[PDB]
Amino acid sequence: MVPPINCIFNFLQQQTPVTIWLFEQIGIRIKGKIVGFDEFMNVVIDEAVEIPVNVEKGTPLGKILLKGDNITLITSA
Amino acid sequence: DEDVAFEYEIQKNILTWKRYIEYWKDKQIRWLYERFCSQTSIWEDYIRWESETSRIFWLFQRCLKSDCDRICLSYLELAIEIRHALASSLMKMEMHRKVWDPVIKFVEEKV
Amino acid sequence: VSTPELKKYMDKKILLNINGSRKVAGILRGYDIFLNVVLDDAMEINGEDPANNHQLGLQTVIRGNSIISLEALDA
Amino acid sequence: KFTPSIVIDPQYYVDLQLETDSESMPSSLKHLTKPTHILDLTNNDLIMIPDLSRRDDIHTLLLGRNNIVEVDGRLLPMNVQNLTLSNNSIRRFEDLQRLRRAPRTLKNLTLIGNQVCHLANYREHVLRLVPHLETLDFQNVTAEERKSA
Amino acid sequence: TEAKNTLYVSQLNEKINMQRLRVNLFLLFATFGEVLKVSMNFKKQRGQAFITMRTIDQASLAQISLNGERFFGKPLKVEFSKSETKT
Amino acid sequence: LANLIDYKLRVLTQDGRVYIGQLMAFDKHMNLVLNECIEERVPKVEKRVLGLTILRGEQILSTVVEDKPL
Amino acid sequence: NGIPVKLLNEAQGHIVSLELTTGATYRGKLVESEDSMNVQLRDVIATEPQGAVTHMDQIFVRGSQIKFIVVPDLLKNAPLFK
Amino acid sequence: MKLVNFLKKLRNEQVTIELKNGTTVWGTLQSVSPQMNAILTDVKLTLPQPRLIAMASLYLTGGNIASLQYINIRGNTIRQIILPDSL
Amino acid sequence: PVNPKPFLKGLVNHRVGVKLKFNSTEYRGTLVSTDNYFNLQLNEAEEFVAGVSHGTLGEIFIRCNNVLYIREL
Amino acid sequence: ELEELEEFEFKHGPMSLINDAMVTRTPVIISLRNNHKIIARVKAFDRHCNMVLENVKELWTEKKGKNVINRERFISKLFLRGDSVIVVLKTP
RNA sequence: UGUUACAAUACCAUUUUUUGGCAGGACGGGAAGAGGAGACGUCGCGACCCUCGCAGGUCGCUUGAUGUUUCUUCUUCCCGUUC
């Protein structure tokens, strides 16, 4: 019963580690902690770690503003 | 040649004039259309095709021989590109108070 | 913008297919004018034959530019 | 003889209604509109059909009831999947011995009411050199029949 | 009855593809003028059909002509239809 | 294009498929509606008849005019 | 308004076919059409681009993944001839 | 200002439009839309070099160089239109 | 709660990295200016092709249409 | 005063290199989405980065069954949709 | 006074238009011999079948057509085009 802009911000208050999927690029995923966003879902993320989908490694990228037009699917852990 | 068949078509409602001229259109087209004409809209078309100065003048003259008001505009334009021409136009096809006035205003300007 | 009427699909187990030929089942919590769909009970259906239970109660959300379509599993 | 004024002024969707205008030889088929699927040259005084180059659009070439004596072998139209030639002045096989190089998308070919049609050994010789067509003179063709050619 | 634009078609051979049967009743009746509309149903109007010609008089030729010709294995009948074909 | 109403339009979509149909109407987004539309993929070969279809202006690459009306 | 969207709004209660931009075709009964070309589709029979055919109860495809819909042919008589 | 209005100066101008699928259009603009949708005339389009999808589109038209009397192109598909060198 | 326009205008004059949407190309440089619509302007741009450097380029502009993300190094 | 807030954010925003290349008449190199690197001068800038160029020297890459060759052409006048634009890079 | 047409004025953020994009000799067809094949569907040529009237389902194909998806040519004759 929650519209999605009120369901982004509960990642932000509770500060959950969040897995985010890209858009028409299935080999790589990004995982991190949501630190900021906007009305067009352009997301600034903390502790950003790449996930090669094809053992899942990581390259620590830390602070990333991920532009929302490649954002697909927002989860957590 | 393509002109033999065309000729046959011609000689045997402006469809032969269209098929000969508009298919070619350039020189060939000119040859055709003009010929057809000699054998208002048609005149206009011919003029367009032509579009040298002398030729244009000739065309205008031809048109004048036998939308008079409409033509008069054309005459005026020709003159611009005069007074004599305007006079000629007036004498053949005597609506033309505002055009006459305009013409005069050139004289006035000159003065 | 008109509201996309998915009120029939509220609290319903739906099946979102996603660009890159991804398929994600879940239960709808919310939507918006951009059709950004919130799913309770996230179930990632991957390729061969696992079924990745992704977010069981943590109400995932999918951006509307990546949603291909949706099948309500129930009526 | 087939004025290009005549060729334009009968098109409807089911073709070119060009039927009862009795002409002699095609000179201006240059003037076809180009989305033509049917050429309706029936009830015409045709003795031949020349002047059809690579017009890959016609499906049904009507030539029925035409004083026609000859069907030819390099006369193009590439997708004639229907073709009538009935009710004409054709009278001998080797008039139409040039139906070998008719294209391979040829399926309906009618020759009823002609002088060629009443000959014995009929369906063998026309399925000969036209081996793949479907219906012949409003008659379906089986493949067991096609072992004749 | 009347004698109008729509020539009544009957007793066709039912073993034919209906899209093949419209075409083969187009190319057959194209010798008697332009065939404008052939309406036809396999929803139990099967065996019978409607063919509407352009000219009134061109329908009068083929009905005298083709009433009794074999066509895919059956000698068909051609009549004048009771009512002018709609649409 | 309002000039081009009620003509047959050979309209080329994004994936190389070509539609041929009578233009019923268009709009701001070039959303087209096509009476007795036919769909062909590989280019006469490989054609499918659709009928009265819509065509969204997102997918059109170009549209050209096929033929005159009745 | 948009005449195609106005056309699609009259197509409610009718059986359509929806081919999608990945290629799959959705034949079903159009009951609810949205102004942004979003369509709720009942009793849908669905066909993959490779040819896998399934039937589904309810499908709802977004606007910007639709190639084209095919409305039934009764609509082209009125009120969109003007 | 708005360079969409810059293209509205290009009426009857003999340009070469290049499209996103590699289609090279060569012809004269009659008009252009405020969403850059370009109608053209007396235009033959080439699909330069390669000969290696789009190509199907060129063959879709009476078109590899195919010329069509009237062509309307969606403005979102244009990559770049080359204008006459005398301008 | 660093919102993106507060995030990025504060990130001006920092050697930031930008990955494109193609992943064939990245750019490392100092972000000079950024509008509301997230066009980027980088100075002393080094091009990173597939994660390895392509070369030094200079004052560069990146369209909004290709910015996959942007990172601070 | 709508336009002044539009044009001064235009002035020292990310549209500076498209505004500076034209004023100083210095060629900027433009790499497009299909790898058509375009080095050219700028005549005008738009909101969408629509660009009208002069003395365009488009360079692209053609791949075959041996060493890749370089294909380049000179275009005197060019109008360019901003959609293909990835990178505007000014060379000194 | 009304109707129609074309321009001016009023307008890059996910569903539309400001891109998720890119990477004698040649040719064709048919047949024979020696070292293209299997799936999923989608429309056709025959019928022992079904069905019976005015408002296409099933089975063969005895070498019917056609899109995904995996794997790995030479000789001889006949018919057309070109020099």
UniProtKB/Swiss-Prot annotation, chain D:
It comes from the Eukaryota. This is U2 small nuclear ribonucleoprotein A'. Residues 114-149 form the LRRCT domain. GO terms for cellular component: cytoplasm; nucleus; Prp19 complex; spliceosomal complex; U2 snRNP; U2-type prespliceosome. GO terms for biological process: mRNA splicing, via spliceosome; U2-type prespliceosome assembly. Keywords: Leucine-rich repeat, mRNA processing, mRNA splicing, Nucleus, Repeat, Spliceosome. The keyword Nucleus applies. Belongs to the U2 small nuclear ribonucleoprotein A family. It is found in: Nucleus. GO terms for molecular function: U2 snRNA binding. Involved in pre-mRNA splicing. Associates to U2 snRNA in a MSL1 dependent manner and is required for normal accumulation of U2 snRNA. Required for the spliceosome assembly and the efficient addition of U2 snRNP onto the pre-mRNA. LRR repeats lie at residues 35-56, 57-77, 79-100. Present with 3630 molecules/cell in log phase SD medium. Signal peptide: none annotated. Belongs to the CWC complex (or CEF1-associated complex), a spliceosome sub-complex reminiscent of a late-stage spliceosome composed of the U2, U5 and U6 snRNAs and at least BUD13, BUD31, BRR2, CDC40, CEF1, CLF1, CUS1, CWC2, CWC15, CWC21, CWC22, CWC23, CWC24, CWC25, CWC27, ECM2, HSH155, IST3, ISY1, LEA1, MSL1, NTC20, PRP8, PRP9, PRP11, PRP19, PRP21, PRP22, PRP45, PRP46, SLU7, SMB1, SMD1, SMD2, SMD3, SMX2, SMX3, SNT309, SNU114, SPP2, SYF1, SYF2, RSE1 and YJU2. Interacts with MSL1.
Curated annotation (Swiss-Prot), chain E:
Its main location: nucleus. It is found in: Nucleus. The keyword Metal-binding does not apply. One of its GO terms (cellular component) is U2 snRNP. GO terms for molecular function: U2 snRNA binding. One of its GO terms (biological process) is U2-type prespliceosome assembly. Transmembrane segments: none annotated. Residues 5-83 form the RRM domain. It comes from the Eukaryota. Present with 504 molecules/cell in log phase SD medium. Involved in pre-mRNA splicing. This protein is associated with snRNP U2. It binds stem loop IV of U2 snRNA. Belongs to the CWC complex (or CEF1-associated complex), a spliceosome sub-complex reminiscent of a late-stage spliceosome composed of the U2, U5 and U6 snRNAs and at least BUD13, BUD31, BRR2, CDC40, CEF1, CLF1, CUS1, CWC2, CWC15, CWC21, CWC22, CWC23, CWC24, CWC25, CWC27, ECM2, HSH155, IST3, ISY1, LEA1, MSL1, NTC20, PRP8, PRP9, PRP11, PRP19, PRP21, PRP22, PRP45, PRP46, SLU7, SMB1, SMD1, SMD2, SMD3, SMX2, SMX3, SNT309, SNU114, SPP2, SYF1, SYF2, RSE1 and YJU2. Interacts with RDS3. Interacts with LEA1. This is U2 small nuclear ribonucleoprotein B''.
Curated annotation (Swiss-Prot), chain F:
The gene is SMB1. Transmembrane segments: none annotated. C-terminal extension may function as a nuclear localization signal (NLS). It comes from Saccharomyces cerevisiae (strain ATCC 204508 / S288c) (Baker's yeast). Component of the Sm core complex, present in spliceosomal snRNP U1, U2, U4/U6 and U5. The core complex contains SMB1, SMD1, SMD2, SMD3, SME1, SMX3 and SMX2 (Sm proteins B, D1, D2, D3, E, F and G, respectively), and is probably a heptameric ring structure. SMB1 specifically interacts with SMD3. Plays a role in pre-mRNA splicing as a core component of the spliceosomal U1, U2, U4 and U5 small nuclear ribonucleoproteins (snRNPs), the building blocks of the spliceosome. Residues 1-69 form the Sm domain. It is found in: Nucleus; Cytoplasm. Present with 861 molecules/cell in log phase SD medium. This is Small nuclear ribonucleoprotein-associated protein B.
Swiss-Prot record, chain I:
This is Small nuclear ribonucleoprotein F. The chain holds residues 12 to 84 of 86 of the full protein. Its main location: nucleus. Belongs to the snRNP Sm proteins family. SmF/LSm6 subfamily. The keyword Nucleus applies. GO terms for biological process: 7-methylguanosine cap hypermethylation; mRNA 5'-splice site recognition; mRNA splicing, via spliceosome; spliceosomal complex assembly; spliceosomal snRNP assembly; U2-type prespliceosome assembly. GO terms for cellular component: catalytic step 2 spliceosome; commitment complex; cytoplasm; nucleus; pICln-Sm protein complex; Prp19 complex; spliceosomal complex; U1 snRNP. Present with 2570 molecules/cell in log phase SD medium. The gene is SMX3. Residues 3-73 form the Sm domain.
